[PDB]
Amino acid sequence: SLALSLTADQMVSALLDAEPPILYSEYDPTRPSMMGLLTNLADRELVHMINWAKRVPGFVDLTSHDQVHLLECAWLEILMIGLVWRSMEHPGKLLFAPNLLLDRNQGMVEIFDMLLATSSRFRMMNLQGEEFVCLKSIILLNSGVYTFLSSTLKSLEEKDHIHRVLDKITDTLIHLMAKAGLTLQQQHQRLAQLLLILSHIRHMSNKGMEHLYSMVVPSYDLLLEMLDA
Amino acid sequence: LALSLTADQMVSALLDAEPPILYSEYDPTRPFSEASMMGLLTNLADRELVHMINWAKRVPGFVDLTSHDQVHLLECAWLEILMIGLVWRSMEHPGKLLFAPNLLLDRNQGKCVEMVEIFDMLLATSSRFRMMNLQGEEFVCLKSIILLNSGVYTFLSSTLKSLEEKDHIHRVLDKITDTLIHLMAKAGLTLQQQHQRLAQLLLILSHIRHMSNKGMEHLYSVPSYDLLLEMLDA
Numbered sequence: 105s106l107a108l109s110l111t112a113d114q115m116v117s118a119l120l121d122a123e124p125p126i127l128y129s130e131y132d133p134t135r136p137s138m139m140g141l142l143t144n145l146a147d148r149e150l151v152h153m154i155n156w157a158k159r160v161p162g163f164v165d166l167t168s169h170d171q172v173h174l175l176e177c178a179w180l181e182i183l184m185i186g187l188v189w190r191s192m193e194h195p196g197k198l199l200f201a202p203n204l205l206l207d208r209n210q211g212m213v214e215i216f217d218m219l220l221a222t223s224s225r226f227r228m229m230n231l232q233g234e235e236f237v238c239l240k241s242i243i244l245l246n247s248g249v250y251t252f253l254s255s256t257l258k259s260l261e262e263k264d265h266i267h268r269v270l271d272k273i274t275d276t277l278i279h280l281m282a283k284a285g286l287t288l289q290q291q292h293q294r295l296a297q298l299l300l301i302l303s304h305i306r307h308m309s310n311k312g313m314e315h316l317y318s319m320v321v322p323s324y325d326l327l328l329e330m331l332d333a
Numbered sequence: 334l335a336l337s338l339t340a341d342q343m344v345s346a347l348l349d350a351e352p353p354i355l356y357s358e359y360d361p362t363r364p365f366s367e368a369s370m371m372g373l374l375t376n377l378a379d380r381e382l383v384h385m386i387n388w389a390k391r392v393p394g395f396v397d398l399t400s401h402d403q404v405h406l407l408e409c410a411w412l413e414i415l416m417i418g419l420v421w422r423s424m425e426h427p428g429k430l431l432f433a434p435n436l437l438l439d440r441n442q443g444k445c446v447e448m449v450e451i452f453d454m455l456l457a458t459s460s461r462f463r464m465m466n467l468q469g470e471e472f473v474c475l476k477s478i479i480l481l482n483s484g485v486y487t488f489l490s491s492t493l494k495s496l497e498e499k500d501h502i503h504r505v506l507d508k509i510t511d512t513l514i515h516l517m518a519k520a521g522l523t524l525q526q527q528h529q530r531l532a533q534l535l536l537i538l539s540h541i542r543h544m545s546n547k548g549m550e551h552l553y554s555v556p557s558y559d560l561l562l563e564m565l566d567a
């Protein structure tokens with residue numbers, strides 16, 4: 105596997121090159137709904153996410169089935185971390201798209217507040233683009249790894265592979281911090297601080313999901329089809 | 334005092350603060366029904382909660398926070414703490430959850446649901462801990478991280494006080510991180526292995542959050558603010 109042979113700098117480069125573009129809401133600036141705009145935006149982001157996933161080093165070494173399970177578990181967290189990153193330089197506001205910039209007053213409010221808090225945390229920490237892409241990849245690989253239903257040798261090799269790629273991403277994060285001039289202590293601390301926020305993103309994704317089942321999630325089969333294509 | 338602790342004193346303080354393992358209500362009618370399974374687990378959890386508050390009060394830095402912030406952290410973290418305790422106890426019992434020494438359940442007895450899905454996840458966490466050879470000293474660090482980290486991002490914070498509280502939480506979390514690293518360095522791990530193992534332990538916390546959320550979601554009808562406040566004051 106090419107992925108396990110990458111240096112820190114090549115891992116960063118691969119992830120930066122794979123980044124999807126920032127998409128616009130289909131809001132017509134000449135025409136005078138919220139869920140409609142977000143749904144349409146998310147549906148377009150999802151197509152890019154599948155193609156971005158395929159470019160995350162190590163991801164395509166997995167079976168199609170395991171690729172889908174990871175996307176199933178991670179998709180909402182990935183959209184959410186994207187949103188939080190885009191919003192970082194806009195305190196008090198969520199930048200769903202350049203033409204859909206919302207404050208607290210608008211759009212559940214609970215989930216909004218949590219997204220804003222994550223954004224403030226990223227700002228306070230001076231989160232860098234290179235760090236962002238590492239975290240986004242970690243979410244993809246980590247979110248679904250503990251819930252693989254299979255007991256075959258293959259499933260064991262797949263889990264092991266995921267853990268090895270996650271270790272590479274960890275090495276990458278540490279290398280970026282050492283290059284930026286952080287001491288060893290600061291490196292371990294900052295890595296912990298970044299990984300701990302992932303647990304908040306899991307939470308937000310779960311609450312988002314919970315607030316939905318008062319009323320569509322991409323199915324296994326839909327995701328499998330999108331991967332195959 | 335908490336920010337002046339060395340790695341070794343932090344470990345010591347956490348080890349000394351560990352709550353006892355409780356027993357489930359003696360001699361329930363077996364086999365279990367949904368109602369009585371939930372009855373036994375609820376009673377067990379309610380008793381564990383009192384000990385958890387006493388344990389929390391001894392986590393270095395926790396009692397420096399306002400009562401209000403102490404409660405908010407326990408509110409967000411309590412189920413994750415019970416869950417990580419269960420996973421730790423179950424580590425040396427593959428395929429089984431050790432709710433208590435006298436309540437050791439295998440997957441088959443999860444099917445008393447609406448349960449089995451969350452059981453499977455708990456078992457997977459237990460196997461992950463086993464495979465990684467998770468040590469007691471590491472466990473107590475992780476459990477403290479959950480307490481301090483789970484509720485820290487959802488402080489409705491405008492005041493300088495709220496900012497100093499959050500800063501304090503982050504400084505104590507940094508100390509726990511240093512502590513975990515020190516334990517790993519002492520155990521003989523290289524620098525690379527140290528960073529990797531720390532990452533692997535912290536990433537499991539995200540799965541424990543998930544299990545806590547799903548547990549909550551599968552609840553078809555939580556310790557109140559007032560209960561938690563009262564237990565802290567006492």
Ligand SMILES: COc1ccc(N(CC(F)(F)F)S(=O)(=O)[C@@H]2C[C@@H]3O[C@H]2C(c2ccc(OCCCN4CCCCC4)cc2)=C3c2ccc(O)cc2)cc1
Pocket residue numbers: 139142143144145146147149150180183184186187200212215216311312313314315316317320321322323
């Ligand atoms: C269905 O899944 C959820 C889960 C939670 C919520 N939410 C409202 C709550 F149900 F919770 F009340 S939410 O958590 O607040 C969610 C976070 C943020 O706001 C919502 C939203 C958001 C809306 C709608 C959507 O549908 C797209 C999926 C529909 N498609 C998938 C497969 C093809 C056909 C159907 C996804 C995402 C956001 C978003 C958007 C973009 C972004 O780049 C970043 C963030 C809403 C929907």
Ligand SMILES: COc1ccc(N(CC(F)(F)F)S(=O)(=O)[C@@H]2C[C@@H]3O[C@H]2C(c2ccc(OCCCN4CCCCC4)cc2)=C3c2ccc(O)cc2)cc1
Pocket residue numbers: 367370371374375377378379381415416418419432443445446447448449450451452453455547548549551552555556557560
């Ligand atoms: C039988 O039907 C199900 C259905 C699902 C599950 N669950 C999945 C499974 F665990 F079986 F795999 S579970 O819902 O996720 C939940 C996790 C675990 O089992 C339940 C339970 C649990 C019960 C109750 C409770 O407090 C109840 C209320 C507490 N008090 C608050 C204020 C005063 C009044 C009440 C907390 C916790 C557990 C526990 C318990 C202790 C522990 O040390 C570790 C774990 C289990 C059985």
